[PDB]
C-alpha cells in the first residue's frame, strides 16, 4: 500500500472524540454513548475514514494480567463494527491512557511497558479476524518517556500485534513519535522494521489562532500560509516520498469563530495534506462541528470545504463572509473579492432564487470581483441579526455563504461590577443585549498599573484566552471564575466584538 492509495482510500477522515476516550468512561464528558445513526450521518457528509479514540483505564483490571473489562470489550467491538460495516477505513487506538498511566513508562519502565504490552496483545486478538479497513493506532500523544523508549514501545507493540499472526500479520499500524509531534518524528523518531506500518502526526498551529488564545481572532497572512507549508513539506520529504504512508490523526480549530478565517485555515490546510498525500481526519469533540443530537454541521460550509478539499477538489474563497452593516447606516454597493482557486463562480442565491446579474450585482472580467448593488442589500435588510444569506455556488469545490447582518450599537444593562474575593463561586454573568453583534475577543487590564489582569500567568499581553476564560452564551457575556481569582484590584475588561471595532466596557471592582 503506498502513501497515495492510503489517501485515496481514507481522505478526508472524522474523529469520534470524547466520546469512548472520556474519563472514567463513555458518556462521561460532554457527548452521550455514540448512537449507530450518528455513523449514518458521517457517511451522509462523505468522510471515508473515522477515529474512534478509546481509553481504556478505568476498565481495566488488576496485575498481572490486566484483564480487559468484558463489557467494555464488547462495548468498543460494537462500535468499531458499526463504523466498519459502512465501509469507513476505521482506526482504533489507545487514547487518554497516555497520561493516565503509561507517562509511568519514565520512572517505572519494566513494569508499565509489561502492562502495555498485555492491554495491547488483548486488544490485537479481540480484533484480529477484522477486514483491513481497520488499523490499529498503538498510542495517542505518548508522554513522560525518553525518545529511545518511545522507539522501543513501538517496536515491542508492533512485535506484539504481528505475533498473534492472521491478519494481523499484515494489518496496519500507526506509530509516531512523542507527543504524536512533527518536530519528534523527523528527529528523534525512527521507523519499526515492518512493510505495514503507517506514520502519525497532529496539527494544531499556530495553537493561538485554533484556540483563539490571546485576542489572535484571524488567520491567512502570506506568511502564515507559507509557514503553514513549510511546516509539513519536510515530512513529505522524509517520509512520504520514501514510501511511508502518513495519517495526520488530528487537526482543525479549537473554538476560532471567524467564518472567513476558519473557512480559509481549513481549506489550505487539507489542501495542503492532499498535495503532500497525507491523510486528514478532522479533530470534533462533539461540540464544535457536528451536533450529533440535531444531526446537523453546526458550520455546514466548513464541512463541505474539507469533504471537497479532502477529494482534492480546490474550493473558492469570499471575503467578506459575514457582512455587517449597522441599523440608520447610509447604503453604498458592496464589494465582495473571490479567492477562486481555480473555479468559476456560476452564480449567487437567495434560498433557491438567484439574483439578476447586472442589476443585482456585477463582476469583473477576471470574475474575482463581485458588486452587490446598494439596492440590491437594501431590499435584503428591523430587528438586529442575520437578514439574508447570499450563496455563491462555484462550478466545482464548495458553496460560500455570506451572512447579512444587520446590526445596533450592543447594550448592557449593567457595565459596573463589584466582586468580593472572598465570595467568589462561579463565572460572572454579564447580561447584554449584542444587537446583532457577536463576541471575538476579551482583554483585561489593572486600573493602577495598566498591566495584565493575567500578569502573573501571561506576562506579555492583557489579552485572555477562549473558553478557560470568557464565553458567550445566549446573547450575555460572562467572565470565567479563573479569571475573577486573579483580580486583585479594580480593574477594566474589554469584550471585542464583530464587527471590528465594537465593544464594550465592563469595569470591575475589587473589595475583601
Ligand atoms: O468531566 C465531567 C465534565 O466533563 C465535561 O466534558 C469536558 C471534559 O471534562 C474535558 O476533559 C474535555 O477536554 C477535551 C477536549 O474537549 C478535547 O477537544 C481535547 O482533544 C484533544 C485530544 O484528545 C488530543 O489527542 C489532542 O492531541 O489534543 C486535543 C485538543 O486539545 O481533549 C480534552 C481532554 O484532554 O472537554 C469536555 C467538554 O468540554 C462535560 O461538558 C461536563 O458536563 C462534565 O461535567
Known sequence: ITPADLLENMSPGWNLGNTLDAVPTEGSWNNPPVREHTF???????????????????????????????????????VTDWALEREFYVVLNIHHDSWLWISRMGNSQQETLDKLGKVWKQIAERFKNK???????????????????????????????????????????????????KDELLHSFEPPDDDRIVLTYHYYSPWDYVSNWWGRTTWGS?????????????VYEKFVREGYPVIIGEYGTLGANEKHSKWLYHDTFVRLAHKYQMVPMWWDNGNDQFDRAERQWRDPVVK??????????????????????????????????????????TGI?????????????????AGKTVSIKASCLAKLLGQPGVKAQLTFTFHKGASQVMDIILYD???????????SQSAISGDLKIPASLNGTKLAT??????????????????????????????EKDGDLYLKERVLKYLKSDSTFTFELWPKGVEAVVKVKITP
Open 349 to 365: 442565491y437567495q434560498k433557491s432564487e438567484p439574483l439578476k446579474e447586472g442589476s443585482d450585482y456585477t463582476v469583473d472580467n
Open 222 to 234: 502570506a506568511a502564515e500560509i507559507s509557514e503553514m507549508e513549510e511546516d509539513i513539506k519536510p
Open 304 to 345: 463541505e470545504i474539507v469533504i471537497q478539499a479532502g477529494r482534492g477538489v480546490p474550493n473558492a474563497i469570499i471575503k467578506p463572509a459575514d457582512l455587517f452593516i449597522k441599523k440608520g447606516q447610509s447604503i453604498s454597493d458592496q464589494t465582495v473579492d473571490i479567492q477562486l482557486n481555480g473555479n468559476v463562480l
Open 442 to 471: 476579551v482583554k483585561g487590564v489593572v486600573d493602577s498599573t495598566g498591566r495584565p489582569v493575567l500578569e502573573e500567568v501571561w506576562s506579555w499581553t492583557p489579552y485572555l484566552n477562549y473558553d478557560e476564560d470568557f464565553y
Open 409 to 419: 450599537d450592543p447594550k448592557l444593562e449593567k457595565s459596573e461590577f463589584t466582586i
Open 40 to 78: 449514518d450521518d458521517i457517511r451522509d457528509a462523505g468522510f471515508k475514514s473515522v477515529r474512534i479514540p478509546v481509553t481504556w483505564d478505568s476498565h481495566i483490571g488488576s496485575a498481572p494480567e490486566y484483564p480487559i473489562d468484558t463489557d467494555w470489550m464488547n462495548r468498543v467491538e460494537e
Open 131 to 181: 477486514s483491513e479497513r481497520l488499523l490499529f493506532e498503538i498510542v495517542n500523544e505518548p508522554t513522560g518517556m525518553s525518545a529511545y523508549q518511545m522507539n522501543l514501545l513501538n517496536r515491542e507493540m508492533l512485535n506484539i500485534i504481528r505475533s498473534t499472526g492472521g491478519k494481523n500479520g499484515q494489518r496496519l499500524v500507526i506509530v509516531g513519535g512523542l507527543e504524536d509531534n
